[PDB]
Design a protein around this nucleic acid. Structure first.
Lengths: 80, 135, 199, 87
RNA sequence: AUGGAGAGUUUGAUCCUGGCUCAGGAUGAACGCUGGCGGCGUGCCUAAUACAUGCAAGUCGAGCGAACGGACUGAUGUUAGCGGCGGACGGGUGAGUAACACGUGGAUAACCUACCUAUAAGACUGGGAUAACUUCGGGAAACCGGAGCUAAUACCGGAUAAUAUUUUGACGCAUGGUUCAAAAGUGAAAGACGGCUGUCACUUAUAGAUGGAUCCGCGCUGCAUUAGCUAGUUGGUAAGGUAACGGCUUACCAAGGCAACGAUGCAUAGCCGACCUGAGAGGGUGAUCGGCCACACUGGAACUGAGACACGGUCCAGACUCCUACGGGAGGCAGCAGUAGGGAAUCUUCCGCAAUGGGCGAAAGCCUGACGGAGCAACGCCGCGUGAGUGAUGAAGGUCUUCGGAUCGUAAAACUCUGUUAUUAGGGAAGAACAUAUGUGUAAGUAACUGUGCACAUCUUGACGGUACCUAAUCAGAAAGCCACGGCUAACUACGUGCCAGCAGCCGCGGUAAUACGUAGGUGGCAAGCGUUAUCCGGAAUUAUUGGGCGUAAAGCGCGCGUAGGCGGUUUUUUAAGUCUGAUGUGAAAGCCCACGGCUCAACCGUGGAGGGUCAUUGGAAACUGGAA
């Protein structure tokens, strides 16, 4: 099987082994049809916290870690 | 407006304020609370039976009754027909429908019902105004 | 019979002869009632739509909410809504019996179907509103084949519409064809009842 | 456990039955797993029955246990016979 | 192509704008007047108020001990009990819940699973009790406590045994995986049979099926006159315990985490398939049927158990209701009926397990207020009636009258005619397939047999119910009412009254000549129904996405500077998020539509399609929007 993967931006790295990833996507309005940008914040695990605020990273889901995290850091591609 | 203005502020329709509000409310004697019921009819007690002068364009002495319904609500109700047998402490059935002339009467007392007799000489239109089939 | 009333007063209020073929609108071709003899006022749009609906409804003896239900079935079928509606009325068992020639009118044919003298396809069908399909057999009950009323009208019927094959011997019918607009009553404007129900 | 049984689908005094694989705890006309066929006991003379073969033999191998009359219905198609042949 | 109607009302008169009202379709409806029948459905929406009384969960004596009791050694029962399984299903209700509760799509390499199926390996050896029973005491019951015995497929101790745990070597982050070679320690049953074995009890491993559990993306009420919310809160490190991950909990670190993309708070609400309305877009709703959730007088808790923190189970607290010898005890209809109460309003304290399904049993069988049926209610939909042919649209009588007549009216007598219905008097289905038992062969396994699976044909049985339904006679006889008639809006006259009595949805009417009030004739609309009231959609383009506007009718902020956001000049290359086009999986069933078939038709029922997604995975296209150069 396959676990879902998201690509977002690091908006918080103030906690150890944890970063906040902002995955912005698009949702159309049911009535008017205009596509509206909405964003969702994901809390992801990274044992070696090499991600710094401003990096676009690759996120994949996993089993529940802590009360909120359900994702792990797969790939870091930006430098900022 | 523009589409973006509509997305941010979706259109808001007007609310419909319904006539005969006292038929839309129930009571709970155990919890001493008012409920929402939407009743076709309500039953009450006549606390005052009298006559009301109508609006200015018209002129006729109209009979009415101050009725305290099953709720703790005191409304004024019309008495259709010619003759009525209602005094104080009379149990009546009250339906919707207001009287245009009479200001402050938004209900009608159902004739030919619980403790309310029909019209004595009515022969055509006996569904309304109570009274059974003659012979 | 649901109506059970004056078939002249209806044909006098209406513009057609309903049942009798003229005998009703001869001496008094105006409306019935106290104000019947005096002059007639003009009819509005609604009055004309309602009049034509009453023409076809009282012609077949059906009531509302069954005239309307049959009208609803007609719109489902392909083609003109008005045409399929009158075709469906002509396919009613009580109407087919009269148009076959078994009875001398519409009301009597209903009592022949109602009391079970018909035996469609050899089986007792006592429902006047049964919808006859092409390729069936409208016979007569064996015990009722010696009915004076049935044999009094079997010979005076004469003309039988082309969509009905009638056998004078054995007292049987066939319903060979789907009726066309030509064979249907021509005094009824089908386009005026369709507009009435769209109001 | 898993039971191959009949679900009533008829009106008053006109019952129609579907041959359905369902859990024993589920309601009679409630949750099901798979529909296998149909059973009409009020048809003309012989009760007309319709049964699938691939799924019926699939559930029997999986441990589904037919009721008393589904056994009869599966026998009139020889399903119980071919289930017995593959020992 | 299958689909879209308006009208009245602001003025001396007009055109706009704009609100109000009406004509349509519906309902778990209620009320008023009426009321013949049948078939399908539906029927406490309010007090998750309180409950009298009956039933709603038992079964297995082939697991086994009886004072057992007892045909005839004693068949059979369970009187009573131990033990196993079931009581977590089925049935009810929508109080709570704005939540991963529910819908849809996924993930679990973070998960449990009795019965059922299949494959293997087995099921060895001993022991001590205790129910029941007997006999003593207590206590007003409820019950409780002493002694003396007795079994079990009850319990306990050893033997042996896995892919069980520890240490060993040979991916998608936490990894998964199957070989290795050591250590500890984990079982069981018998019953009823046939000539050692068959059946169905068991135990251990695996898988399958089934049923559960958790996590995640998206969707899913109103209020901003609810703006700042949290402190296990948020992350980490250890430990614990959970079927399992995890602040799930606890210590110690750090100060974190969510929020105008609406944190929080308040109010409201079970969610959905689906239903009503609409041409559609949408709007409203969440009765009956099905899926999920939550609850069981209110509130906590655990035990047994595969599964409960358990509607007809346990303990405690509380509020009630009842008994008491005053010390103490018993109870929970939101199961089916039914009662009281509240309300405008919602039913029998019925029959049967005959079918389907469920529990238990080898089965016969037992239990089943599930369910299948009956009782009541026009509550709804559908179908049929209450009569027909000829017959003077002239009797006699009403009502008007222009006094001549007209209208009720082919309506009526009047003759013929039928029996749908109704009455009586005879037949009389289907739903029935069984299970078991009996025989007959076959397959596997057998030393062989019994036995089991399968194949066939025999015997059996129905609450409904002598009910559908059919056949004979007989009679037009026993079977129509409701509302309107000024315009919207089909249907007009006379009389009574005289701005009174009264009517009215709006325009409004009524002040001695009202088609508007009451009545009488006539008319018209429907019809076993007809109107009124209550609520929703429409009409309403009157929240205008489809589909409105802001000079004077309501509407451009008094004006700048500006942040988020929204939008963005031309060309080339690339990408493929949107976009378009396929293929898979799913969007349960029941519903809507179409077709077809069965009820005599229809309602209704059953089959087959269709349709339904901001859906997921995976190819293809590259103009546009988006990204990169």
């Amino acid at each position: 099987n396959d676990r879902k993967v998201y690509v977002g931006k690091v908006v918080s790295d103030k906690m150890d082994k944890t970063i906040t990833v902002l995955v912005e996507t698009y949702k159309t309005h049911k009535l008017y049809g205009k596509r509206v940008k909405y964003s969702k914040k994901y809390k992801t695990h990274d044992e070696n916290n090499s991600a710094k605020l401003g990096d676009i990273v690759k996120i994949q889901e996993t089993r529940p870690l802590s009360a909120t995290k359900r994702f792990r850091l797969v790939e870091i591609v930006e430098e900022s | 407006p523009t589409i973006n203005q509509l997305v941010r502020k979706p259109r808001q329709s007007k609310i419909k304020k319904s006539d005969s509000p006292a038929l839309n409310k129930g009571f709970n004697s155990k919890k001493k609370k008012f409920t929402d019921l939407n009743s076709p009819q309500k039953r009450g007690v006549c606390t005052r039976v009298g006559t009301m002068t109508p609006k200015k364009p018209n002129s006729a002495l109209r009979k009415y009754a101050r009725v305290r319904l099953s709720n703790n609500i005191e409304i004024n109700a019309y008495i259709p027909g010619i003759g009525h047998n209602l005094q104080e402490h009379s149990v009546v059935l009250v339906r919707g429908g207001r009287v245009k002339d009479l200001p402050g009467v938004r209900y009608h007392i159902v004739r030919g019902a619980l403790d309310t007799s029909g019209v004595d000489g009515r022969r055509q239109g006996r569904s309304l105004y109570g009274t059974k089939k003659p012979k | 019979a649901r109506f059970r009333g004056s078939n002249w007063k209806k044909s006098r209020r209406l513009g057609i002869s309903l049942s009798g073929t003229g005998k009703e609108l001869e001496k008094r071709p105006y409306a019935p009632g106290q104000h019947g003899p005096n002059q007639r006022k003009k009819l509005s749009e609604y009055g004309l739509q309602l009049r034509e609906k009453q023409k076809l409804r009282y012609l077949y003896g059906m009531t509302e909410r069954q005239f309307r239900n049959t009208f609803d079935i007609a719109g489902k079928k392909f083609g003109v809504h008005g045409e399929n509606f009158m075709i469906l009325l002509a396919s009613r068992l009580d109407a087919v019996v009269y148009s076959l020639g078994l009875a001398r009118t519409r009301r009597q044919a209903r009592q022949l179907v109602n009391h079970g003298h018909i035996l469609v396809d050899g089986k007792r069908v006592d429902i006047p509103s049964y919808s006859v399909k092409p390729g069936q057999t409208i016979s007569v009950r064996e015990k009722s084949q010696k009915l004076n009323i049935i044999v009094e009208s079997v010979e005076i019927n004469n003309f039988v519409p082309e969509y009905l094959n009638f056998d004078a011997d054995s007292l049987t019918g066939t319903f060979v064809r789907l009726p066309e607009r030509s064979e249907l009553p021509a005094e009824i404007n089908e386009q005026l009842i369709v507009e009435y129900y769209s109001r | 456990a898993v039971k191959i049984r009949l679900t009533r689908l008829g009106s008053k005094r006109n019952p129609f039955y579907r041959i359905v694989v369902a859990d024993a705890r589920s309601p009679r006309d409630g949750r099901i797993i798979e529909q296998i066929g149909t059973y009409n006991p009020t048809s003309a003379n012989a009760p007309e029955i319709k049964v699938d073969e691939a799924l019926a033999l699939k559930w029997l191998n999986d441990g589904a246990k037919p009721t008393d009359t589904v056994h009869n219905i599966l026998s009139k198609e020889g399903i119980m016979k071919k289930f017995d042949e593959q020992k």
